[PDB]
Structure formats: structure tokens, C-alpha cells
Amino acid sequence: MPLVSMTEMLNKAKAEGYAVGQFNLNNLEFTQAILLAAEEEKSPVILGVSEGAGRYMGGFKTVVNMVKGLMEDYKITVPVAIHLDHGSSFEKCKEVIDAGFTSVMIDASHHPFEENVEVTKKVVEYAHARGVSVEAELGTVGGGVIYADPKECEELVKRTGIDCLAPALGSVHGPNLGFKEMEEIGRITGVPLVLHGGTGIPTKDIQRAISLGTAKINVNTENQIASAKKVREVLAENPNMYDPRKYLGPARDAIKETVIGKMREFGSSGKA
Amino acid sequence: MPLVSMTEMLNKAKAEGYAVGQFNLNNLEFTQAILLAAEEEKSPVILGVSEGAGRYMGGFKTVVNMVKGLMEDYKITVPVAIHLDHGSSFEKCKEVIDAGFTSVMIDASHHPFEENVEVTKKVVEYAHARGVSVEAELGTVGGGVIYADPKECEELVKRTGIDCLAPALGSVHGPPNLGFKEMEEIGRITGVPLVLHGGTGIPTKDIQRAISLGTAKINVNTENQIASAKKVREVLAENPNMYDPRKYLGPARDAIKETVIGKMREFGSSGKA
Structure with a gap:
């Protein structure tokens, strides 16, 4: 029932000087872990869903249904967003919104600037008509880094009316950031900033990025690492184990503890 | 194509001489595997949910929501029931039905017979009001094996109006000597589809015999857990640096599916949707 867009949590995070974590959904245990960490920490949270993840989990309707189910069964009170990560097209953003997502990222960073503005503005018109927040990226985040101007x-924010921006400034996916650029993209833009490739980034870079207008930090890989590592440990100690709950439960608890750490480091804890 | 009760699929299976697999849901990958197997095989299926599994998956509303989502997202066309495995009380069966289950099993055998009739009949009134099928169990399935009288x-079937009966006659949970004499008698005298728990160990000959005598529902859980865990162990050993969950639970999902497909061909559910 507390399913919301990102607009308000991110604007209050920017004003108050903390960041909200986007934690990526890969399956049921992932979703459970992130929502339980959010409730335990009384922290706003963003449930990130890549196109790949949506596909692996069967579809976006399945993801929204599963999130609403957990939201009822665990009686979640904190603000929770369902956010399309790295939306490849307008059509993807529309499908995801029609499924009941509260938030979309349209990433046309690998396209010319003007062609990015066209599709990002189109997504903003469709989404804003429905109470859906919209994120956009300029520059390229590594997985290959091209800095944002x-x-x-x-110009992109003035032209589109997006609710937050992801300026690529040295961040990389998987396991050296331009605070000079980030600080004054923050000053010049006046919208909450999004920091991609959150995995690896030190508490010190995190807090400095917060200081200069970053209000959203994306974490996916850290949770995958903690989960797979716990799964390995439990299957190794118990070679006779076949009950999926007896090794994916521990993995869920590992994900939860990782996410709690991130929520405390970002300062979202206690802000719900 | 919404969800259906067990009543029609089980009566049809009994008349035609096949069984429908109940395959137990443990998480998203399990549910995906079972529904994809059903659709690939054009076979009816029953999604079993224990009390334990229901809690593990967050709650019964989450389980129904996730199943509805997959049925829309996968465009499932075959009949699909959502069935509570081993309901302990009327309260549990009511909770599960209010969540959107299409089927419940109530076992009040650990009660005097008249009080057992009370609880099962209450469950039947509540469920039949909502197009929900009711299974009942007598005797105990091993994991403590007591044959059903x-x-x-x-008398329980006659008095309650349950749609199917699960007579414990030597079945055990996990990874064979079943009372076919008693099963023939209970099937003939009750005139309802019979249910067989502990599907995992039981060999093909015992399975086909049970079907021949009116067993129309077979419960499978441990086999899918074994297939999934074996595939995960293989993948994690061969890929020491892998951390992406989709890369080991993805293959495991496929393992579960092939497992379920096997059972669907063995039970004769394949092509009967």
C-alpha cells in the first residue's frame, strides 16, 4: 500500500542530505531481503529491476504482483518504489508502467544527446501523466566511461522535466569520480543526482557524493556476491542438503544484512 | 484463463485413468518451472504449498499474487489449481482460501472421528461457497506410518462432502510397500478421486498400480528439491567466481522443469489439458 514514485523520497533525501538505496531484484528471496531490511531500518527503499531481471522473473506484472504480496504479508510501512533500471526504450518504460511500476529510468546515454532528449521527454510525458518518476542518464557508466557534460x-533537465539525473562520472558495473563535475551538475541542474555502479564505491566517496546532491545510489552486484558466497558456504558445510529454503534462506539473510549496511552508510535508516 | 479447483481435473483424471501431479512451490523459480512444464506438456497441474513454504515465500497472498502474475506473463492455457498441502485446522484453510487458493487439504485425523467430521465439514461449507476443492487425509504419511481405516x-466422505480423499497407506516424505488392497476398497466404496502423498520415492510400477485403483492426484516435492540442488552444486563447482544468482538458479529452474515434465509423462497428465 505504501508503493510510491521516487520523486518525494529523493527530493526529501536531497534536502535532508542522505541517499536512498536502489537495490536490484533478481528473484523472490532478493525482494524479500530488501523489503525486510527497509522495514527493519525504517528506511525508504527503491526496488531496482533491469530488463534482464524482469525477463528472468517471468515479466513485470509478476514483479509488481510479488512486491504487492510481500508488501501486504510483511505489512511494510516504509516508502517503496518499483523502478525500471537502464530502460532501453520508450516502449519498455510504457510496458513497465502499464504493469504497475512507480518509476522508470530511460537510458539513451549511448545515443546522440538530442536523440536522448526526444525519447526521455516522451517518457516524462507518459510517466508524469501517471504519477511515475523518471530518471535519465548522460555520459556512460562502465561494465568504457564517457563523462557527462x-x-x-x-539542457536535458530543462528540456525534459525529469525528476532526477544519473551523471556518469567514473562509476563502473561489477566490482575515481568527478566530484568537480558532480558538484556543479548538482548546482546547475537543481534535481537529485543518481550514482550508478554503487558496488565497490568506499563510504568516503559515498558521503562526499551525498554532500554534492547525490540522493539515489544503485546497488546490485554486492547483494549477488553476498548471496552466492553464503550459498557456497551452506552447501559446502552440508553436502547432503537439497531443501532450497535451507540454503536460500541463509542467502536471503546475507542479502538483508548487506542492504542494512548500505542503508546505514547512505543515511536512509530512520528517514521513513 | 483464471485458476480452477481440483474437483473437475481430478474427476476427469480418475475416469480417464491418469493422475495430475501436485508439484510443491518453494520460490519463484520453482513456480516458473512447474507452470512452464505444464504449458509445454499441455497438462493440468496442481501447485502445492505447505504451511512452511507459504511462510518462506512471505505469505499465502504473495504466493497467489506470484502465481497469477506468472499465469498472465507466461499466458498459461492449461488448468492450474493452487492447493494448500496439509491444512492443520479450519482457521488455516480459511486464511489460505481468503488469500485466493482454489483448493485446500484439511487433515483433522489427530482428532476423534466425530470432531474430525466437524472440522472437515466446516472447511467444506466455507470452501464450496467459494468454488474451492477440499482434500481430507486419514492415517499418517511417514517422514510414523498408520494405515487409513x-x-x-x-463415513468421512459420506458425511463431509469432500471432493477427494488422501488415504495414508504406507507413503513417506523424502527419498516401497503400499496397501493396494485397502486402496482398491476405499476407492470403490467412496467413489471419489484418491490422493497419494510421498510421490518422490514410489517406483513407476507402484505409481501405475495406484492410478489403476483410482489415485488421481500424486504429490511431488523432494524430487524437484534434489534436481535443483544437484544442478546448483554442479554449476557452483564448475564456476568458482560466479555470483549472478540467475546463472545457477536459472539452470536449476530448467532441472526442476525437466523433472516435472518426466512426472507429467509418467502420470499420464501430458496432453490431457
Whole structure:
């Protein structure tokens, strides 16, 4: 029932000087872990879903249904967003919104600037009509880093009316950030900033990025690492184990503890 | 194509001489595997949910929501029931039905017979009001094996109006000597589809015999857990640096599916949707 867009949690995070974690959904245990960490920490949270993840989990309707189910069964009170991560097209954002997502990222960063503005603006028109928040990216985040231009950032936000921006400034996916650019994209843009590739990034870079307008930090890989590591440990200690709950439960608890750590480091804990 | 009760699929299976597999849900990958197997095989299926599994998956509303989602997202066309495995009380069966289950099993055998009739009949009134099928169990399935009394089975069916009966006659949970004499008698005297728990160990000859004598529902859980865990162990050994969950639970999902497909061909559910 507390399913919301990102707009308000991110605007209050920026004003108050903490960040909200986006933690990526890969399956049921992932979703459970993230929501339980959010409730335990009384922290706002963003449930990130890549196109790949949506597909692996069967579809976006299945994801929204599963989240609403857990939201009822665990009686979640904290603000919770369901956010399309790295939306590849307008059509993807529309499908995801029609499924009941509260938030979309449209990533046309690998396209020319003007062609990015066209599709990002189109997504903002569709989403804003439905109470859906919209994130956009300029520059390229590694997985291959191409820096975002602060005046390009200014123009994209003025032109589209997005609710937050993801300026690529050295961040990389999997396991050296431009605070000079980030600080004044923050000043020049006046919207909450999004930091991709959250895995690896030190508490010190995290807090400094917060200080200069980053209000959303994306974490996926850290949870995959903690979960797979716990699964390995439990299957190794118990070679006779076949009950999926007896090794995916521990993995869920590992994900939960990782996410709690991130929520405390970002300062979302106690802000719900 | 919404969800259906067990009543029609089980009566049809009994008349035609096949059985429908109940395959137990443990998480998203399990549910995905079972529904994809059913659709691939054009076979009816029953999604079993223990009390334990229901809690593990967050709650009964989450389980129904996730199943509805997959049925829309996978465009499932075959009949699909959502069935509570081993309901302990009327309260549990009511909770599960209010969540959107299409089927419940109530076992009040650990009660005097008249009080057992009370609880099962209450469950039947509540469920039949909502198009929900009711299974009942007599005797105990091992993991403590006590055969079901055939006249107890007959009187319970006659008195409650349950749609199917699960007579414990030597079945055990996990990874064979079943009372086919008593099963023939309970099937003939009750006139309802019979249910066989502990499907995992039981060999093909015992399975086909049970079907021949009116067993129309077979419960399978441990086999899928074994297939999944074996595939995960293989993948994690061969890929020491893997952390992406989709890369070991993905293959495991496929293992579960092939497992379920095997059972669907063995039970004769394949092509009967």
C-alpha cells in the first residue's frame, strides 16, 4: 500500500542530505531481503529491476504482483518504489508502467544527446501523466566511461522535466569520480543526482557524493556476491542438503544484512 | 484463463485413468518451472504449498499474487489449481482460501472421528461457497506410518462432502510397500478421486498400480528439491567466481522443469489439458 514514485523520497533525501538505496531484484528471496531490511531500518527503499531481471522473473506484472504480496504479508510501512533500471526504450518504460511500476529510468546515454532528449521527454510525458518518476542518464557508466557534460545535463533537465539525473562520472558495473563535475551538475541542474555502479564505491566517496546532491545510489552486484558466497558456504558445510529454503534462506539473510549496511552508510535508516 | 479447483481435473483424471501431479512451490523459480512444464506438456497441474513454504515465500497472498502474475506473463492455457498441502485446522484453510487458493487439504485425523467430521465439514461449507476443492487425509504419511481405516474413509466422505480423499497407506516424505488392497476398497466404496502423498520415492510400477485403483492426484516435492540442488552444486563447482544468482538458479529452474515434465509423462497428465 505504501508503493510510491521516487520523486518525494529523493527530493526529501536531497534536502535532508542522505541517499536512498536502489537495490536490484533478481528473484523472490532478493525482494524479500530488501523489503525486510527497509522495514527493519525504517528506511525508504527503491526496488531496482533491469530488463534482464524482469525477463528472468517471468515479466513485470509478476514483479509488481510479488512486491504487492510481500508488501501486504510483511505489512511494510516504509516508502517503496518499483523502478525500471537502464530502460532501453520508450516502449519498455510504457510496458513497465502499464504493469504497475512507480518509476522508470530511460537510458539513451549511448545515443546522440538530442536523440536522448526526444525519447526521455516522451517518457516524462507518459510517466508524469501517471504519477511515475523518471530518471535519465548522460555520459556512460562502465561494465568504457564517457563523462557527462554539465551544460548537457542542464539542457536535458530543462528540456525534459525529469525528476532526477544519473551523471556518469567514473562509476563502473561489477566490482575515481568527478566530484568537480558532480558538484556543479548538482548546482546547475537543481534535481537529485543518481550514482550508478554503487558496488565497490568506499563510504568516503559515498558521503562526499551525498554532500554534492547525490540522493539515489544503485546497488546490485554486492547483494549477488553476498548471496552466492553464503550459498557456497551452506552447501559446502552440508553436502547432503537439497531443501532450497535451507540454503536460500541463509542467502536471503546475507542479502538483508548487506542492504542494512548500505542503508546505514547512505543515511536512509530512520528517514521513513 | 483464471485458476480452477481440483474437483473437475481430478474427476476427469480418475475416469480417464491418469493422475495430475501436485508439484510443491518453494520460490519463484520453482513456480516458473512447474507452470512452464505444464504449458509445454499441455497438462493440468496442481501447485502445492505447505504451511512452511507459504511462510518462506512471505505469505499465502504473495504466493497467489506470484502465481497469477506468472499465469498472465507466461499466458498459461492449461488448468492450474493452487492447493494448500496439509491444512492443520479450519482457521488455516480459511486464511489460505481468503488469500485466493482454489483448493485446500484439511487433515483433522489427530482428532476423534466425530470432531474430525466437524472440522472437515466446516472447511467444506466455507470452501464450496467459494468454488474451492477440499482434500481430507486419514492415517499418517511417514517422514510414523498408520494405515487409513476404510470405513472411517467411507463415513468421512459420506458425511463431509469432500471432493477427494488422501488415504495414508504406507507413503513417506523424502527419498516401497503400499496397501493396494485397502486402496482398491476405499476407492470403490467412496467413489471419489484418491490422493497419494510421498510421490518422490514410489517406483513407476507402484505409481501405475495406484492410478489403476483410482489415485488421481500424486504429490511431488523432494524430487524437484534434489534436481535443483544437484544442478546448483554442479554449476557452483564448475564456476568458482560466479555470483549472478540467475546463472545457477536459472539452470536449476530448467532441472526442476525437466523433472516435472518426466512426472507429467509418467502420470499420464501430458496432453490431457
